[PDB]
Structures are given as C-alpha cells and as structure tokens.
Design a binder for this molecule. Structure first.
Ligand SMILES: Cc1cc2nc3c(=O)[nH]c(=O)nc-3n(C[C@H](O)[C@H](O)[C@H](O)COP(=O)(O)OP(=O)(O)OC[C@H]3O[C@@H](n4cnc5c(N)ncnc54)[C@H](O)[C@@H]3O)c2cc1C
Ligand SMILES: Cc1cc2nc3c(=O)[nH]c(=O)nc-3n(C[C@H](O)[C@H](O)[C@H](O)COP(=O)(O)OP(=O)(O)OC[C@H]3O[C@@H](n4cnc5c(N)ncnc54)[C@H](O)[C@@H]3O)c2cc1C
Ligand SMILES: Cc1ccc(NC(=O)c2ccc(CN3CCN(C)CC3)cc2)cc1Nc1nccc(-c2cccnc2)n1
Ligand SMILES: Cc1ccc(NC(=O)c2ccc(CN3CCN(C)CC3)cc2)cc1Nc1nccc(-c2cccnc2)n1
Ligand SMILES: [Zn+2]
Ligand SMILES: [Zn+2]
Lengths: 228, 228
C-alpha cells in the first residue's frame, strides 16, 4: 500500500487550488492510499527559520547559525514538534504532492517555510548525501501549480519565459537535491480568467492523471530538461 | 540625495550576512544616503499571506482570493500596517538591497513573505503595468546573496547549475516584473568553508563595490542573460 502526503498552500477551501487538493484526496483515497494533507494555512504553519525551532540548548550561544544548529538538533531529537510532525509525514510518504498557486515565480512563503524548516540536514540530505544520494531517495514528488499568467506568456518567447525556467529551484534545487524522483509538474494556467467549464476541465484533467500516477516515469531533473 | 532600503533576512547579527548588511549601512550612511533597514527576523515579520492582511471588509465573504482582495484593499487604503510600513519604505527608496543567505535556491521564507505581502497589485505592478512598465520603475534593486555551495558547484557543469539559473525567479519574475532596474547580483560563495581572511576579503569586496554603486549600469534582465 502507498502513503501520500499533500502539502497544500491555499487560504480558501473553495478556491481552484482547494478543488485540485480535494480531487487528489478523493481519488487517492479511493485507490486505497493512505492520505495526509498538511493544510499549511489552516495549521497556521510557522514559516520563519528561528532559534525557536531548536528545543535543545544551542551548541553556540555567541553566534547562531540556523543550518548548523538544526542539523545538530535533528541528530539529538531536539527540533520543535511542528517540524518533527511534518518529518514523520514525509518519512512515511511514498509520494509528496505540493499543491500551490505560483507566487513570484515560486511557492507561497508559508510553503517556502515548510521547505526551509522541515527539510533539514540529517533528515532530507546530508554532506555527502544529496541529489541522487539524497536521503529522501526512493520517494516521488510532484508539483501541482496554478498561475495568473497564461500558457502562452510562459513560453520561451513570452514575457514570463518558459515555465520550466521557474521550476528549476523547486525541482532541481530542492526536490532532486533531497533525492526525490520528480514526476512531471501539473501546471494549471490562469484559472481566474478561464471559463467555469474550463476550470472544470482542468480539475478533471488532474483527477484523471492521478488514476495512473503510480505508472508514471520521473523526469530527468537536469539543467538540460529545464533550459534545453 | 538618495534613499536606500536594505531588506535583510538573517537571524544572527554577527553572521557573515550581518557583516555584509552592516558594511552597507556604514558605507551608504557615510555617502550621505538616507538608509533604512528592514531587519525581518528582528521585526518578527509576518510571512503568511492571509485575510488578516486586509483591514477592511472583504469584497467577497463566500470565496477569499488573496490577490484580488489585497489589490482592492490597496486602492482603499485598507492593508495591515506592517505591509503599508514596508510600502512606504519601498515607495521612497531609490535603491533596494536584499541581503540574504540562499535557502533552497531562493530567499528565506520570511523574505519570500515580504515579497508576497508587500508587492501587491496597485502598488508594485498593475495590469497593465509590469516588467518595463511596472510601477516601481525608476528604482534600482540588487540581490546580495550568500551560499553554502562553492562557486565551482554553481557553474553550468557543476552539480548546482549556473548561479544565474536560480536568480531568474527573483530578478526577472519579481524585481523586473515590478519595474526595477536590476544591478548585477553580489554573490558571496561558501563563506562557512572559507578562511576568516577570505571572509574578510568578501566583506571588503562588497564595501568597495558600494563606493561606486550609483555609477553602475543595470543588467539586461532577460532569458538570454540568465540562460544564454
Ligand atoms: C502574492 C502573489 C504572487 C503571485 N505571483 C504570480 C507569479 O509570479 N506568476 C503568475 O503567473 N501568477 C502569480 N500570481 C497569481 C496566482 O498564481 C493565481 O492567482 C493563482 O494561481 C490562482 O489560483 P486560485 O486557486 O487562487 O484560483 P481561484 O481564484 O480560486 O480560482 C478561480 C475561481 O474558480 C473557482 N473554482 C473553484 N473550484 C472550481 C472548480 N472545480 N471548477 C470551476 N471553478 C472552480 C473559485 O471559487 C474561483 O472563484 C500571484 C498571486 C499572488 C497573490
Ligand atoms: C534552510 C536552508 C537552506 C539552504 N539552502 C541552500 C541552497 O539552496 N544552496 C546553497 O548553496 N546553500 C544553501 N544553504 C546554505 C546557506 O546559504 C548558508 O549557510 C549561508 O549562505 C551562510 O551565510 P551565513 O551568513 O549564515 O554565514 P555565517 O555562518 O554567519 O558565516 C560564517 C562565519 O563567518 C563569521 N563572520 C561574520 N562576519 C565576518 C567577517 N566580517 N569577516 C570574517 N568572518 C565573519 C561568522 O560569525 C560565522 O561564524 C541553506 C541553508 C539553510 C539553513
Ligand atoms: C492575483 C493575480 C491573478 C492574475 C494575475 N494575472 C497576471 O499577472 C496576468 C497579467 C497579464 C496578462 C495578460 N493579459 C492580456 C490580455 N488581456 C485581455 C488580459 C491580460 C494575463 C495575466 C496576477 C495576479 N497577481 C499577481 N500578484 C503578484 C505577482 C504576480 C505575477 C508575477 C509575475 C508574473 N505574473 C504575475 N501576479
Ligand atoms: C547550512 C549549510 C551550510 C553549507 C552547506 N553546504 C553545501 O551544501 C555544500 C555541499 C557540498 C559541498 C561539496 N564539498 C566537496 C569537498 N568537501 C571537502 C566539502 C564538501 C560544498 C558545500 C549546506 C548547508 N545547508 C543546506 N540546508 C538546506 C539546503 C542546502 C542546499 C540546497 C541545495 C544546494 N546546496 C545546498 N544546504
Ligand atoms: Zn535535478
Ligand atoms: Zn527580467
């Protein structure tokens, strides 16, 4: 049996993102998958990387270095419980779906904070132990993104550039760095200026794709895939 | 006379980022510039985009859309005071420096939240009124970034890819979209594994560059500059 974690970043249950999230829960649940949703805004999830994230005594009280102290805290089981709650979900998951609207060619800050705080050294990667040897190897990840801009604006000759250009920090710099195999992204362009039937169609496309998600091959997460 | 805003995202005053920020304050202050620092962690700056950001009544209580409601709130002077405090600093600034460590090939979530919440429609851009016609036109912006990875890892043939690849969402998708002219980024690679004298040199390089920052030409912020 499979475990899926959906890390969901939208304020509004009736939003288009909310519908994409609900559809994923329904379809995966129907398949028999174990499903967990981290509804970040509902959780009032803390995005800031601060010394409050380490519940043990710091190694160095003269100079605070977030990466160093969370790495040591992870080894000593001294991380704040909101972080370790999310680590448990990720550790058990076979597939992690991120469901979010694009904010400034990236994830909303609350989701950026989940990346910053949850994927610490010792947990998600180590040195050595990143990219193909990252510590989340054997898991799948997939970005389900919605945009303001249209598909045609997100091409090589459109004002926004190819949509693969903005995926690079998330897919390569984050997911692949932690050792995930990355499934092709689901990009739902410009729902706000689409018709209600068009929105209906983009939702159904997602639901349909999920019916056979476990049969998909990951993408080659390389500079060539993104910029070639 | 010139106004500079430094949006600074580091938890530790004695950090390498803290030193780069302090050097900027000292040098710009010595030049006679008006200098403001938004020390995000010290301000406990709120990164989450929520309905609390709108202090007026929502246009639509059935379905909450953050972009729509902040755009209307901006027009009606009904945004939370932490946002409008930052908008005042940006509105008056001639140069905005972002000083931050790279987190997951991007900005720390607290700074991502300052982008998400501060640069709202009507203020930073409109439709129409983006990229070259963005509403912050006539201002300069500059990213001062520090990394874990080495310069050689951040090349086309290194594991991280060229550093220009990760700059794309920040420089093109955000700064240029709002109409900033973008100065060449300052990238201080791998201070943590550099020697103390090397760190000293990278600090002095920044200080020296700032002596003539007002004489620099902006970069062409294009797909070609980033991926060419
Ligand atoms: C801070 C910020 C930064 C942004 N940065 C960018 C950027 O860099 N690039 C870019 O392109 N865009 C950007 N945007 C735009 C953003 O990506 C979009 O507004 C977002 O993707 C839209 O998704 P949504 O879920 O909120 O849509 P919604 O507004 O919720 O969707 C539209 C309508 O569809 C309805 N709906 C819900 N479910 C269904 C259904 N099943 N069938 C039919 N209709 C349904 C909803 O109720 C809603 O009224 C930014 C927005 C913000 C606020
Ligand atoms: C969540 C997270 C995500 C990350 N993601 C990435 C990523 O995607 N890519 C990547 O490359 N890296 C990443 N990193 C690494 C991160 O970018 C670095 O740790 C950061 O850039 C280092 O800067 P710092 O200011 O914290 O250095 P510091 O640790 O503060 O600098 C090193 C030492 O220099 C000292 N110092 C201060 N001032 C001076 C001075 N004037 N002269 C000499 N020494 C001085 C400090 O006190 C310190 O002890 C990530 C880190 C975290 C926590
Ligand atoms: C919340 C919202 C909803 C939709 C959009 N839409 C677009 O940004 C957009 C802009 C121009 C067009 C061009 N189109 C030409 C034809 N006429 C009829 C419509 C306009 C289409 C979509 C933005 C937002 N808000 C928003 N907020 C912050 C940043 C951005 C953003 C940033 C970078 C690139 N694109 C958008 N966007
Ligand atoms: C807080 C910190 C400080 C430094 C680094 N350093 C590096 O990630 C790194 C990794 C490998 C090398 C290779 N080097 C080979 C030679 N031997 C001697 C040293 C290792 C250098 C730097 C990471 C972190 N933490 C951190 N936390 C989350 C994500 C990332 C991150 C993400 C993507 C790419 N690079 C780093 N990094
Ligand atoms: Zn990759
Ligand atoms: Zn540009």
């Amino acid at each position: 049996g499979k475990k899926v974690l959906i890390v969901y970043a939208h304020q509004e249950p009736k939003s288009f993102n909310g519908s994409l999230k609900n559809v994923a829960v329904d379809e995966l649940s129907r398949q028999g998958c174990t499903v967990t949703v981290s509804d970040l805004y509902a959780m009032n999830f803390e995005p800031r990387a601060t010394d409050k994230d380490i519940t043990g005594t710091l190694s160095n009280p003269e100079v605070f270095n977030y990466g160093v102290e969370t790495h040591e805290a992870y080894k000593q089981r001294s991380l704040a419980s909101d972080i370790t709650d999310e680590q448990k979900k990720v550790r058990e998951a076979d597939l992690v779906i991120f469901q979010f609207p694009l904010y400034w060619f990236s994830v909303p800050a609350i989701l950026k904070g989940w990346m910053d705080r949850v994927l610490c050294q010792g947990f998600a990667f180590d040195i050595p132990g990143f990219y193909d040897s990252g510590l989340l190897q054997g898991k799948l990840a997939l970005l389900s993104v919605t945009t303001g801009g249209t598909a045609e604006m997100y091409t090589k000759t459109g004002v926004n550039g190819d949509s693969r250009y903005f995926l690079w920090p998330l897919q390569h710099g984050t997911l692949h760095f932690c050792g995930f195999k990355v499934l092709a992204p689901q990009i739902s362009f410009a729902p706000e200026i689409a018709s209600e039937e068009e929105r209906k169609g983009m939702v159904a496309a997602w639901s349909q794709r999920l019916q056979t998600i476990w049969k998909e091959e990951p993408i080659p997460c390389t500079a060539h895939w993104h910029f070639g």
